[PDB]
Amino acid sequence: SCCSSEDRANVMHNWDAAWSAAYSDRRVALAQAVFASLFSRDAAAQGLFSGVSADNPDSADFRAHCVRVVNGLDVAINMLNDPAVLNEQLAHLSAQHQARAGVAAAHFDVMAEAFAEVMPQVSSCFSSDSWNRCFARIANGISAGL
Amino acid sequence: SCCSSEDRANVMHNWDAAWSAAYSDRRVALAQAVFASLFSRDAAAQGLFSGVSADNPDSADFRAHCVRVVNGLDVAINMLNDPAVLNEQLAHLSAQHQARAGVAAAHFDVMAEAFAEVMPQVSSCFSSDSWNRCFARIANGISAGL
Amino acid sequence: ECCSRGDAEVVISEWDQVFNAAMAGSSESAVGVAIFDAFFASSGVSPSMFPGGGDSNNPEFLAQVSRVVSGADIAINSLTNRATCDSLLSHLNAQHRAISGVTGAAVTHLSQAISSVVAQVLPSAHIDAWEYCMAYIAAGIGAGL
Amino acid sequence: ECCSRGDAEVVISEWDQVFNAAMAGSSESAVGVAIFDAFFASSGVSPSMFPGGGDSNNPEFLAQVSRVVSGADIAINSLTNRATCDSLLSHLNAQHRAISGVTGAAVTHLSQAISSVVAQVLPSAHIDAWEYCMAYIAAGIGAGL
Amino acid sequence: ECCSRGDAEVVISEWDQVFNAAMAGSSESAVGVAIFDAFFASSGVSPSMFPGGGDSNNPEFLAQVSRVVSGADIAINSLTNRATCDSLLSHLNAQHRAISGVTGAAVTHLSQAISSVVAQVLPSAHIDAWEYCMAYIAAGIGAGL
Amino acid sequence: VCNRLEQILVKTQWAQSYGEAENRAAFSRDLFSELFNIQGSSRALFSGVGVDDMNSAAFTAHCLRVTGALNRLISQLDQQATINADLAHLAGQHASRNLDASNFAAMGQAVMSVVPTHLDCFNQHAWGECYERIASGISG
Amino acid sequence: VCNRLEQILVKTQWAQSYGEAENRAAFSRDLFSELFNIQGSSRALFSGVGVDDMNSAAFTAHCLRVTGALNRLISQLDQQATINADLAHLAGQHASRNLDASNFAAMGQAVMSVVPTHLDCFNQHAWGECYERIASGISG
Amino acid sequence: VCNRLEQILVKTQWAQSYGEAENRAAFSRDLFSELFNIQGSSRALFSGVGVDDMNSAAFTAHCLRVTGALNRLISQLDQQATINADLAHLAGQHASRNLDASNFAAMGQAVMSVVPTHLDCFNQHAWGECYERIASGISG
Amino acid sequence: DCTSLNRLLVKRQWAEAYGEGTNRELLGNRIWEDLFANMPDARGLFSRVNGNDIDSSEFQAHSLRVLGGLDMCVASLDDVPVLNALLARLNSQHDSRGIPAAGYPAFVASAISAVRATVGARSFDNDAWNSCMNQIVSGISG
Amino acid sequence: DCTSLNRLLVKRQWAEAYGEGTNRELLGNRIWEDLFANMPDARGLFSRVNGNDIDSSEFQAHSLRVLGGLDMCVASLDDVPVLNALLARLNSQHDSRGIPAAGYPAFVASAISAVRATVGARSFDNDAWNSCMNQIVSGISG
Ligand code: HEM
Ligand code: HEM
Ligand code: HEM
Ligand code: HEM
Ligand code: HEM
Ligand code: HEM
Ligand code: HEM
Ligand code: HEM
Ligand code: HEM
Ligand code: HEM
Ligand code: MMC
Ligand code: MMC
Ligand code: MMC
Ligand code: MMC
Ligand code: MMC
Ligand code: MMC
Ligand code: MMC
Ligand code: MMC
Ligand code: MMC
Ligand code: MMC
C-alpha cells in the first residue's frame, strides 16, 4: 500500500506520456473519460457537479472543470517527490472538497477506479500497481477529514 | 553563390587568424592594403574619402577610418551566424553609404576584389571561395538600394 | 552551396524544432492557415482557388492545408539526401503542372511564406538557410511553371 | 623547495598567461620599459648606463629592453628543467661579469621588477612563487657579482 | 549496386593493398607491362599502336604504361565519390575519343586486364567487386567508342 | 472505430516510432519492404514508381509520401471533419489502381510489424482500430 | 638536379604525406587552393576546368590528375630515361596555355607549403631539387 | 624584403608553432639537429657549446638562446628601427666565428623544415622573405 | 495582439520553461524572488501561505499551485471559451484578497522574466509573451 | 590614471570578455539589462532600435554595434592620435540624441560590471578599467 520511490517515478512516467503541457485538448479527453465512468457507476454522484454543465460533457463550463481537475492531479503527481510540499497541497485540495457539500470519502473510491479504467487507454505500458498505490497516497490526503 | 553554413564557419576561421581583438595596428595594415589596391584600381574612388586624409594613408585621420571599416566588417562577419540580426546591421551600414554622396554599387565590386587580394597575405590557408561567397552576402546588403 | 548539408540539417532541425516533442500533433493547421494567409498576401493569388476556397474553417480547406504542409514536410525532412529530394520535388512538380493557375513566381511566394511563419513561430530560425533551401524546394516544384 | 616544479609551472604559466594568445606580439616593450622604469627606481641604478641610455623612445634602448625581457623569458620558460636552467643562467652571468656596474643586489632589483610588473599586468600572478623563482634566477645571473 | 560503397572501398583497399607500404615506388612498370601483356592477348589489339610500340624496354612505352596505370589509379582511388568519378572518366573518354583505334569492347579488355593482374599479384583480390567496378570505369572511358 | 483514447496511444506511439527513428527513408522503405514480403502480389502493383529497385531515388521518394501522408492522417485523427475530407481525397487517389480488401488488410499488417519493433510499448488493439479507421476512409 | 639520395627522402615523404593523408581530393584541392592564394593570376588560368567552383566534380577531378600525375613522376624519379620521356609528354600538354616561369616557381611553392604540414619530417632542399628536376622537364 | 602582410602570416605561424609546441628545448634542439643534418660543416662550428652532446645542459641551453633570440626578432618585425638595432647587435655577435653565406642559407633551411611540420598552414614565401629580412641583418 | 502564432510560441516556450517535479519550484522561486524584490509591499498579501518564508512548505505548495493555473491558461490559450471560464474561477479566487491593481502587471513582468531566464533569451518573443500574458490577467484582475 | 600597463590589462581582459559571434550578445545583454535596471529612464533614448524589446533584431544589431565601437577604442588605447579621432566620430554620433550627462557614467558602470562578470572577478582591476573606460567616455560625452 506504500507508494514507493520506484512507484512514483514509475507513475510520473506513465503520466509523462499520455500528457501534453502544451495542449489542453488531450487533458480534456482523459478527464471526460475519467468522468464518463465515474458517473456511469454512480449517477447520483453526477449531481455534485451541478455547479458545472455536467449534463453536457461536451460543454465549455464542464471541459473547464475537467482541466481544473486533471491539472490538480498533475500538480500533485509532481509533488510526489517533495512530500513536505505535497502534504500542504493535499491538505489544501482537501478543504476545497470539505467546502463542497456532499462529496464524501466513498466518492474518491468511485473516482479511484474511474481513473483506473481510463489510464491504460492513454498511457502506454501502464503500471496499474504503482498507480493504484500512489494514486491512493494522494486521494487519501484529499478525502481525509471528509 | 549562397554563403553556406560551412562557408561562414570557414570564413570566420580565416578571419579569426590574421586578427587581434587586442591590437589595432594589425587591423590597420590589413585595411590600408585593402585600400592601397582599391584606389590603385580606381583612383577616382579615392576621392570619396576626401573626408579622411586619404592622400596620406600613413595618417591618423585615415588609419582611424581604416579601423572604423575593418571593424564594421568584423562586426558583420560575426553576425554571419545570427542572420536576423545581421540583416539590420547591413540595412544599417547601408543607409550610412546611401548618406555618402557618390559611392555606388559598382564600388563594392572594386572593394570586393580589393579584399580578395589582401586576405591571402594575412590569413593562413584562406578559402577564397567561402570568402567570396560570404563577403558578397554582406556587401550585397550594404550596397543594396545604393 | 545552395542549401548545403549543414543548412538543411539546420532547417530540418528547426523545422522539427518547431514541430517538436510537445507540439506536432494538434495545430499544424494553426501554423498552416498562418501560412496560407501570408501566402495569399504576398502572392496575391486568390484563395477562391483551393479546396473549400480558403475559409480557415472549411473542413475541406483544412485537409488541403494539412496536405500542403505535409508535402513541404516530406521535402524539408529529406533535403540532406540530394537524389531523393530531386525526385520528391519532381513529383510535386507534375501535380502542379496539372493545374491552371500555378506560376513559378507564385510557388516561391508560398515557399517563402513557410520560412517566414516558421520564423515567427521559432524566432531562432536561421532565416538565411531557410531561404537558401526553401529556394531550392521552390525550384523542383515550380520547374517550368 | 626554492621554486619547485609547481611554482615554476605556475610562473611559466602566468608569465605566458601575460604573454597570451592575444598579446605576445606587439608591446613587450610597453611591458619592458615598465620594467626598466620600476628597475631604475628600486635599484637606483643609472639609466645612463644602457644602450641608448634609457630613453623609452630611443631605437637602441628598445632593442635593449627586448633583448633583456627575452633573456628573462628564456630562463623563466625553462625553470622546470633544473640542469639546463643552471646553464642558461651561468651564461647570462658571464655576460654581466664582463660589465663594470653590475651588482648582486642590483640583479635581484631588476629581477624583482619583472615579477612586480608581471603582477600589475596580471593581478592573479602568484607573487609568492614569482619571487621564489625570480630569486633563483637572480642567483645564476648575479653569481659573484 | 554496380560497384557500391563497400565494393569500391574493397577495391581501393586491395588496389592499394597491392601498392602497399613496401611496394608502390619501384616497379609499377613490372605490374604495368604485365598489364599490357595480358591486354594485348585478350584484346588482340596491336602493340604497334602505342608510344614506343610496346617493347617493354622502350623508354617511351614505359612512360606510357606509367601514364596508363596512373590513370587507372586516379579513377580506382576515387570510386567512393560518384560525382567526381563520372568526371574523371568523362575526361579520359575525350582523350580516347580523339584516337582512331579505340573500341568499347577493347577498353573493357584493358580494364579487365587490370583486375586480373591485380589478382595474380594479390591472391585475395575480391574479384567479384573488381570486375563490378572496373566494369563501371570501363564505361566512362569507352563512352560511345 | 478508433476512439478518443485509442487515438492518443497511437498518436504518441507513432511519433515515438516514426518520429524518433533515424532516417525516415529507411523506415519508409522498411515498411514497403514488408507489404511485399507479406503479399508479393502487390510488389508489382507499384510498377509505375521504380519498384524494381527499392533503393532508388524514385522508389524511396514514394515510400516517404506514404509514411508521410500516413503521418498527415494520424495527426488529424482527432479532427473528424478534416480527416474524413483528407481521407476522401486520398481514396480517389487509389481509385485507378485496382485494390482488393486483401491489400489494405496487408498494408496494415506491414505497418503493425514495422512499428512495434521501434518502441518499448505499443498497444495492438488501439492501433488496429485506427489503422482500420484509416484503411476504411482510403478504400470504402 | 635531384640526386640519388635526395630522391629517396622525397619519394618516401611524398608517400608519407600524399600517401597516408585521408582523401586525396582534399589534399589535391588543398594544393591548388594555394597556387591561387600565392598567385591569383593563375586562378583564371584554369578557366576551362570549372575553376569557378573549387568544390565541383569538374574541378576536383582536375586537381587529382595533377597530384596524380605529380605522383606518376616522383615514383619514376629513379628511372632517368622513363621520367624524361614522361616529363616530355607532360611538357607539350602545357604548350597551349601560356605559362611564365613565375607559375612553375609558384606551383612548387604551393606544393612545398602543403606537404610539410602533413609530415613529422620534411627536407626543404631535397624537395626543392626534385620539384625543380620536375618543373624543368615540364616547362623547358 | 619581408613586407607588412608577409610579416603577419609569419608572426602568427611562428607563435602557432614555436608558441604552441610542447617543450621548446625539444623544438630548439630539433632545429639545430637539422642545421647539422643539412650542413655538417657547421656542427663543429659550435665547438664552444658542448655540441658534442646535443642532449646536454650546455648544448640545449644554446639552441634556446637562438630559437629565443629568433623569437625576440619576429616579434619586433614590425618595429623597423628597433629590429634593425637589435639585428645589428646580433650581427657583431657572429663577427668572431667565420660564417659564409652558405650557413645562413642553411640555417633558414633548417628553420623552414622544422616549422611547417608543426602547423596546419604555413606560407613558404612569406617565411622566406622574413627569414631573409633576418638573415641579412645578422650577416651583412 | 496575442496572435494564433504567439499562442503557438507561448504554449511552446512555456512547456520548456515549465520544469518537472521540483524544477518548477526552480521557475517558481525565480518569479517570486523577483516580484517580491521590485515590490516588497506585495509579500504581505500572502501571510497565509507564509509569504515571508518563500521557501516554506506552505508557500512552495502555493507557489506551485499558481504555476498550475498559469499552465492551464497557456494550455487553453487555443480554445477561448474554456479559458474564459478558467480565468473566471481564478478571478473569483482573487476577488477576496486585497490585491493592488499594480500587482498583476508586476506578476506578469516577473513571470515573463522568469520564463526568459529559464528558456533562455534565445530571441524570447516579449511581444508574444506579454501580448498573451495580458490576455490572461484581464480575466483575473480586471 | 590609465597607465600604459592598464591599457595592457584592459586590452587583454576586454579580449577575453569580448565573446565571439553571439557570445557578444551575451556580454551585450549583460551590460544593457543592467543600465536599464539602475536607470530605466534610459531605455527611452533607444525607441528607434527598439529599446523596449532588448531582445529584438533591431536592438541586438545596435547592442552589437556599440560593443563594436567600444572594441576599437580598447584596440586603439595604445596609439592615442587615432583614438582621439575615433571618439570624435562617436561623439558626433551621440551629439544629436539627448543623452543625459548622468548616462555615460552609468554605461561605464554597466560595462565595467559586465566585463567583470564575463572575465570573472579574478582580482579584476577596477582602477585600471575605470581609469581607461573614462578616458574613453570623455571624447564622446564631454
Ligand atoms: C483524487 C482526485 C481529485 C482531485 C485531485 C480533484 C481536483 C479538484 C480541483 C482542483 C477542483 C477545483 C478547485 C476549486 O474549487 O476551485 C475540485 C473541485 C471539485 N471537486 Fe474534486 N478532485 C478529486 C476528487 C473528487 C471527487 C471524488 C469528487 C466527488 C464525486 C469531487 C468533487 C468536486 C466538486 C463537486 C468540485 C467543484 C465543482 C463545482 O465547481 O461545482 N472531487 N476538485
Ligand atoms: C563591404 C565593405 C564595406 C563596409 C563594411 C564599410 C564600412 C564602413 C563603416 C563602418 C563606415 C563608417 C561609419 C560612419 O559613417 O560613421 C563607412 C563609411 C564610409 N564608407 Fe564604407 N564600407 C564598405 C564599403 C565601401 C565602399 C565600396 C565605398 C566606396 C568606394 C565606401 C565608402 C565609404 C565612405 C566614403 C565612408 C565615409 C568616410 C568619410 O568619413 O568621409 N565604403 N563604411
Ligand atoms: C511550396 C510549394 C507548394 C507546396 C508545399 C505544395 C504542395 C502540394 C501538395 C502536397 C498537394 C496535394 C497533392 C495531392 O493532390 O495529392 C498540393 C495540391 C494543390 N496545390 Fe500545391 N503546393 C505548393 C504551391 C502551390 C501554389 C503556388 C499554388 C497556387 C496558388 C498551389 C495550389 C494547389 C492546388 C489548387 C492543389 C490541388 C487541390 C487538391 O488537392 O484538391 N500549390 N500542393
Ligand atoms: C634579471 C636580470 C637581468 C636580465 C634578464 C639580464 C639579461 C641580459 C641580456 C639577455 C642581455 C643581452 C645579452 C647580449 O649581449 O647578447 C643583457 C645585456 C646587458 N645588461 Fe643585463 N640582465 C639583467 C640584469 C642587469 C642589471 C642588474 C644591469 C645593470 C644595472 C644590467 C645591464 C646590462 C648591460 C649594460 C648590458 C649590455 C648592453 C648591450 O647589450 O649592448 N643587466 N642583459
Ligand atoms: C582501362 C582503360 C584505359 C586506361 C586506364 C587508359 C588511360 C589512358 C591515359 C591515362 C592516357 C594518357 C593521357 C594523356 O595523353 O595525358 C592514355 C593514352 C592513350 N591510350 Fe588509353 N587507357 C585505357 C584504354 C586504352 C585502350 C583500350 C587503348 C587502345 C588499344 C588505349 C590507347 C591509348 C593511346 C594510343 C594513348 C595515347 C598515347 C600517348 O599518350 O602519347 N587506351 N590512356
Ligand atoms: C492505408 C495506407 C495507405 C496510405 C496512407 C497510402 C498513401 C498513398 C499516397 C499519399 C500516394 C501518393 C499519391 C500522390 O501524392 O499523388 C499513394 C499512391 C499509391 N498507392 Fe497508396 N496508400 C495506402 C494504401 C495502399 C495500399 C494498401 C496499396 C496496395 C497494395 C496502395 C497502392 C498505391 C499505388 C499503386 C499508388 C500509385 C503510385 C504509382 O504507382 O504511381 N496504397 N498512396
Ligand atoms: C609541376 C607541376 C605540374 C604538373 C605535374 C601538372 C600536371 C598537369 C596534368 C597532368 C594536366 C592534365 C593533362 C591531361 O590529362 O590531358 C595539366 C593540365 C593543365 N595545367 Fe598543369 N601541371 C603542372 C604545372 C602547371 C602550372 C605551374 C600551371 C600554371 C599555373 C599549369 C597549368 C595547367 C593548365 C592550364 C592545364 C589545362 C587544364 C584545362 O584548363 O583544360 N600546370 N597539368
Ligand atoms: C639567423 C639565425 C640566427 C640567430 C637568430 C642566431 C642567434 C644567436 C645568438 C643569440 C647567439 C648567442 C649570443 C649570446 O647570447 O652571447 C648565437 C651564437 C652563435 N651563433 Fe648564431 N644565430 C643565427 C645564425 C647562425 C648561423 C647560420 C650560424 C652558423 C652555422 C651561427 C653560429 C653561431 C655561433 C658559432 C655562435 C657562438 C656560440 C659559441 O660557440 O660560443 N649562428 N647565435
Ligand atoms: C498570472 C496570473 C496568476 C496566476 C496563474 C494565479 C493563480 C493562482 C492560484 C492557482 C491560486 C490558488 C487558488 C486556490 O487554490 O484557491 C492563487 C491564489 C492567490 N493569488 Fe494568484 N495568480 C496570479 C497572479 C496573482 C497576483 C498578481 C497576485 C498578487 C500580487 C496574486 C496573489 C494571490 C493570493 C493573495 C492568493 C491567495 C494565497 C493562498 O491562500 O493560496 N496572484 N493564485
Ligand atoms: C562607452 C561608450 C559608448 C560606446 C562604445 C557607444 C557606441 C555607439 C555606437 C557604435 C553607436 C552606433 C553609431 C552609428 O552607427 O551611427 C551608438 C549609438 C547610440 N548610442 Fe552609444 N556608445 C556608448 C555609450 C552610450 C551612452 C552613455 C548612451 C546613453 C545612455 C548611448 C546611447 C546611444 C544612442 C541613443 C545611440 C543611437 C541609437 C541608434 O539609432 O543606433 N551610448 N553608440
Ligand atoms: C465534472 Hg468535468
Ligand atoms: C580610406 Hg582608410
Ligand atoms: C538540399 Hg534538396
Ligand atoms: C627552477 Hg631553475
Ligand atoms: C563507384 Hg565510380
Ligand atoms: C512503392 Hg516504395
Ligand atoms: C584546376 Hg583544380
Ligand atoms: C649549438 Hg645547440
Ligand atoms: C491563470 Hg488559468
Ligand atoms: C567608443 Hg571607440
PDB file of N, CA and C in Angstrom, chain J residues 65-113:
ATOM      1  N   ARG J  65      26.672  46.787 -32.312  1.00  0.00           N
ATOM      2  CA  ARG J  65      27.398  47.924 -32.853  1.00  0.00           C
ATOM      3  C   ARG J  65      28.212  48.576 -31.731  1.00  0.00           C
ATOM      4  N   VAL J  66      27.519  48.956 -30.666  1.00  0.00           N
ATOM      5  CA  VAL J  66      28.137  49.571 -29.512  1.00  0.00           C
ATOM      6  C   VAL J  66      29.387  48.816 -29.125  1.00  0.00           C
ATOM      7  N   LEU J  67      29.262  47.529 -28.866  1.00  0.00           N
ATOM      8  CA  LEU J  67      30.440  46.786 -28.473  1.00  0.00           C
ATOM      9  C   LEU J  67      31.482  46.913 -29.552  1.00  0.00           C
ATOM     10  N   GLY J  68      31.022  47.024 -30.793  1.00  0.00           N
ATOM     11  CA  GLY J  68      31.943  47.168 -31.905  1.00  0.00           C
ATOM     12  C   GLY J  68      32.841  48.350 -31.623  1.00  0.00           C
ATOM     13  N   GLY J  69      32.229  49.530 -31.560  1.00  0.00           N
ATOM     14  CA  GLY J  69      32.973  50.736 -31.267  1.00  0.00           C
ATOM     15  C   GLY J  69      33.868  50.486 -30.076  1.00  0.00           C
ATOM     16  N   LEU J  70      33.249  50.342 -28.912  1.00  0.00           N
ATOM     17  CA  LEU J  70      33.981  50.079 -27.681  1.00  0.00           C
ATOM     18  C   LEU J  70      35.181  49.130 -27.865  1.00  0.00           C
ATOM     19  N   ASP J  71      35.166  48.292 -28.895  1.00  0.00           N
ATOM     20  CA  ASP J  71      36.300  47.405 -29.101  1.00  0.00           C
ATOM     21  C   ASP J  71      37.413  48.180 -29.789  1.00  0.00           C
ATOM     22  N   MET J  72      37.045  49.019 -30.754  1.00  0.00           N
ATOM     23  CA  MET J  72      38.031  49.810 -31.479  1.00  0.00           C
ATOM     24  C   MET J  72      38.828  50.589 -30.471  1.00  0.00           C
ATOM     25  N   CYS J  73      38.104  51.232 -29.563  1.00  0.00           N
ATOM     26  CA  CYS J  73      38.734  52.023 -28.531  1.00  0.00           C
ATOM     27  C   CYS J  73      39.817  51.232 -27.850  1.00  0.00           C
ATOM     28  N   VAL J  74      39.381  50.222 -27.128  1.00  0.00           N
ATOM     29  CA  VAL J  74      40.304  49.374 -26.445  1.00  0.00           C
ATOM     30  C   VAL J  74      41.503  49.047 -27.335  1.00  0.00           C
ATOM     31  N   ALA J  75      41.231  48.683 -28.586  1.00  0.00           N
ATOM     32  CA  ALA J  75      42.277  48.333 -29.536  1.00  0.00           C
ATOM     33  C   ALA J  75      43.191  49.507 -29.864  1.00  0.00           C
ATOM     34  N   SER J  76      42.654  50.720 -29.817  1.00  0.00           N
ATOM     35  CA  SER J  76      43.478  51.886 -30.096  1.00  0.00           C
ATOM     36  C   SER J  76      44.087  52.471 -28.835  1.00  0.00           C
ATOM     37  N   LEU J  77      43.487  52.188 -27.685  1.00  0.00           N
ATOM     38  CA  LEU J  77      44.023  52.689 -26.435  1.00  0.00           C
ATOM     39  C   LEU J  77      45.544  52.927 -26.472  1.00  0.00           C
ATOM     40  N   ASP J  78      46.278  52.091 -27.206  1.00  0.00           N
ATOM     41  CA  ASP J  78      47.731  52.186 -27.302  1.00  0.00           C
ATOM     42  C   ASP J  78      48.208  53.439 -28.027  1.00  0.00           C
ATOM     43  N   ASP J  79      47.693  53.611 -29.242  1.00  0.00           N
ATOM     44  CA  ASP J  79      48.008  54.739 -30.106  1.00  0.00           C
ATOM     45  C   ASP J  79      46.930  55.790 -29.899  1.00  0.00           C
ATOM     46  N   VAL J  80      47.299  56.903 -29.279  1.00  0.00           N
ATOM     47  CA  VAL J  80      46.353  57.988 -28.994  1.00  0.00           C
ATOM     48  C   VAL J  80      45.790  58.771 -30.171  1.00  0.00           C
ATOM     49  N   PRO J  81      46.637  59.287 -31.051  1.00  0.00           N
ATOM     50  CA  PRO J  81      46.059  60.034 -32.163  1.00  0.00           C
ATOM     51  C   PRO J  81      44.795  59.429 -32.758  1.00  0.00           C
ATOM     52  N   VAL J  82      44.829  58.136 -33.081  1.00  0.00           N
ATOM     53  CA  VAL J  82      43.655  57.503 -33.683  1.00  0.00           C
ATOM     54  C   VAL J  82      42.471  57.530 -32.742  1.00  0.00           C
ATOM     55  N   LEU J  83      42.696  57.049 -31.532  1.00  0.00           N
ATOM     56  CA  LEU J  83      41.644  57.042 -30.535  1.00  0.00           C
ATOM     57  C   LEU J  83      40.883  58.347 -30.610  1.00  0.00           C
ATOM     58  N   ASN J  84      41.594  59.449 -30.378  1.00  0.00           N
ATOM     59  CA  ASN J  84      41.011  60.791 -30.419  1.00  0.00           C
ATOM     60  C   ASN J  84      39.995  60.788 -31.535  1.00  0.00           C
ATOM     61  N   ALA J  85      40.504  60.587 -32.751  1.00  0.00           N
ATOM     62  CA  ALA J  85      39.695  60.569 -33.962  1.00  0.00           C
ATOM     63  C   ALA J  85      38.527  59.608 -33.866  1.00  0.00           C
ATOM     64  N   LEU J  86      38.752  58.456 -33.247  1.00  0.00           N
ATOM     65  CA  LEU J  86      37.680  57.501 -33.111  1.00  0.00           C
ATOM     66  C   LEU J  86      36.604  58.160 -32.271  1.00  0.00           C
ATOM     67  N   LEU J  87      36.918  58.498 -31.023  1.00  0.00           N
ATOM     68  CA  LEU J  87      35.963  59.159 -30.118  1.00  0.00           C
ATOM     69  C   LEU J  87      35.312  60.364 -30.771  1.00  0.00           C
ATOM     70  N   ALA J  88      36.020  60.947 -31.719  1.00  0.00           N
ATOM     71  CA  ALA J  88      35.497  62.099 -32.390  1.00  0.00           C
ATOM     72  C   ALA J  88      34.233  61.684 -33.096  1.00  0.00           C
ATOM     73  N   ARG J  89      34.351  60.763 -34.054  1.00  0.00           N
ATOM     74  CA  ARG J  89      33.177  60.303 -34.799  1.00  0.00           C
ATOM     75  C   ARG J  89      32.057  59.887 -33.842  1.00  0.00           C
ATOM     76  N   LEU J  90      32.381  59.013 -32.887  1.00  0.00           N
ATOM     77  CA  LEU J  90      31.414  58.553 -31.900  1.00  0.00           C
ATOM     78  C   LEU J  90      30.721  59.768 -31.340  1.00  0.00           C
ATOM     79  N   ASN J  91      31.519  60.691 -30.818  1.00  0.00           N
ATOM     80  CA  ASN J  91      30.963  61.894 -30.248  1.00  0.00           C
ATOM     81  C   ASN J  91      29.951  62.528 -31.187  1.00  0.00           C
ATOM     82  N   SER J  92      30.309  62.693 -32.457  1.00  0.00           N
ATOM     83  CA  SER J  92      29.368  63.308 -33.390  1.00  0.00           C
ATOM     84  C   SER J  92      28.158  62.416 -33.616  1.00  0.00           C
ATOM     85  N   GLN J  93      28.247  61.159 -33.198  1.00  0.00           N
ATOM     86  CA  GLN J  93      27.134  60.242 -33.373  1.00  0.00           C
ATOM     87  C   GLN J  93      26.223  60.219 -32.172  1.00  0.00           C
ATOM     88  N   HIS J  94      26.634  60.871 -31.093  1.00  0.00           N
ATOM     89  CA  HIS J  94      25.807  60.950 -29.890  1.00  0.00           C
ATOM     90  C   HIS J  94      25.467  62.420 -29.609  1.00  0.00           C
ATOM     91  N   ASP J  95      25.950  63.314 -30.467  1.00  0.00           N
ATOM     92  CA  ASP J  95      25.700  64.740 -30.291  1.00  0.00           C
ATOM     93  C   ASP J  95      24.215  65.036 -30.465  1.00  0.00           C
ATOM     94  N   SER J  96      23.627  64.419 -31.485  1.00  0.00           N
ATOM     95  CA  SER J  96      22.212  64.591 -31.798  1.00  0.00           C
ATOM     96  C   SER J  96      21.313  64.196 -30.621  1.00  0.00           C
ATOM     97  N   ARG J  97      21.238  62.896 -30.355  1.00  0.00           N
ATOM     98  CA  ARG J  97      20.422  62.368 -29.267  1.00  0.00           C
ATOM     99  C   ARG J  97      20.553  63.216 -27.999  1.00  0.00           C
ATOM    100  N   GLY J  98      19.518  63.194 -27.167  1.00  0.00           N
ATOM    101  CA  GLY J  98      19.532  63.966 -25.939  1.00  0.00           C
ATOM    102  C   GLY J  98      19.983  63.123 -24.763  1.00  0.00           C
ATOM    103  N   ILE J  99      21.193  62.578 -24.876  1.00  0.00           N
ATOM    104  CA  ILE J  99      21.760  61.735 -23.831  1.00  0.00           C
ATOM    105  C   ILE J  99      22.098  62.548 -22.596  1.00  0.00           C
ATOM    106  N   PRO J 100      21.563  62.143 -21.428  1.00  0.00           N
ATOM    107  CA  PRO J 100      21.772  62.792 -20.129  1.00  0.00           C
ATOM    108  C   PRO J 100      23.220  62.603 -19.690  1.00  0.00           C
ATOM    109  N   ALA J 101      23.818  63.642 -19.115  1.00  0.00           N
ATOM    110  CA  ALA J 101      25.201  63.551 -18.661  1.00  0.00           C
ATOM    111  C   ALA J 101      25.350  62.356 -17.722  1.00  0.00           C
ATOM    112  N   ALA J 102      24.332  62.113 -16.905  1.00  0.00           N
ATOM    113  CA  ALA J 102      24.369  61.003 -15.962  1.00  0.00           C
ATOM    114  C   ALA J 102      24.243  59.651 -16.652  1.00  0.00           C
ATOM    115  N   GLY J 103      24.400  59.620 -17.974  1.00  0.00           N
ATOM    116  CA  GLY J 103      24.279  58.364 -18.708  1.00  0.00           C
ATOM    117  C   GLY J 103      25.576  57.591 -18.935  1.00  0.00           C
ATOM    118  N   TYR J 104      26.609  58.306 -19.372  1.00  0.00           N
ATOM    119  CA  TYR J 104      27.906  57.708 -19.624  1.00  0.00           C
ATOM    120  C   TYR J 104      28.460  57.083 -18.390  1.00  0.00           C
ATOM    121  N   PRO J 105      28.368  57.787 -17.266  1.00  0.00           N
ATOM    122  CA  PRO J 105      28.874  57.240 -16.011  1.00  0.00           C
ATOM    123  C   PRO J 105      28.233  55.879 -15.741  1.00  0.00           C
ATOM    124  N   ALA J 106      26.920  55.810 -15.971  1.00  0.00           N
ATOM    125  CA  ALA J 106      26.149  54.583 -15.772  1.00  0.00           C
ATOM    126  C   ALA J 106      26.555  53.526 -16.781  1.00  0.00           C
ATOM    127  N   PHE J 107      26.657  53.924 -18.040  1.00  0.00           N
ATOM    128  CA  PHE J 107      27.052  52.979 -19.068  1.00  0.00           C
ATOM    129  C   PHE J 107      28.380  52.345 -18.660  1.00  0.00           C
ATOM    130  N   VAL J 108      29.316  53.194 -18.270  1.00  0.00           N
ATOM    131  CA  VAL J 108      30.611  52.701 -17.875  1.00  0.00           C
ATOM    132  C   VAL J 108      30.514  51.716 -16.731  1.00  0.00           C
ATOM    133  N   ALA J 109      29.617  51.973 -15.787  1.00  0.00           N
ATOM    134  CA  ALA J 109      29.467  51.082 -14.644  1.00  0.00           C
ATOM    135  C   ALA J 109      28.904  49.727 -15.070  1.00  0.00           C
ATOM    136  N   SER J 110      27.953  49.788 -15.996  1.00  0.00           N
ATOM    137  CA  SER J 110      27.291  48.604 -16.520  1.00  0.00           C
ATOM    138  C   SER J 110      28.244  47.797 -17.371  1.00  0.00           C
ATOM    139  N   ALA J 111      29.145  48.481 -18.057  1.00  0.00           N
ATOM    140  CA  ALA J 111      30.101  47.775 -18.880  1.00  0.00           C
ATOM    141  C   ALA J 111      31.108  47.158 -17.933  1.00  0.00           C
ATOM    142  N   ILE J 112      31.825  48.016 -17.228  1.00  0.00           N
ATOM    143  CA  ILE J 112      32.820  47.531 -16.308  1.00  0.00           C
ATOM    144  C   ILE J 112      32.244  46.379 -15.524  1.00  0.00           C
ATOM    145  N   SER J 113      30.975  46.482 -15.148  1.00  0.00           N
ATOM    146  CA  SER J 113      30.350  45.383 -14.421  1.00  0.00           C
ATOM    147  C   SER J 113      30.258  44.165 -15.330  1.00  0.00           C
TER     148      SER J 113
END
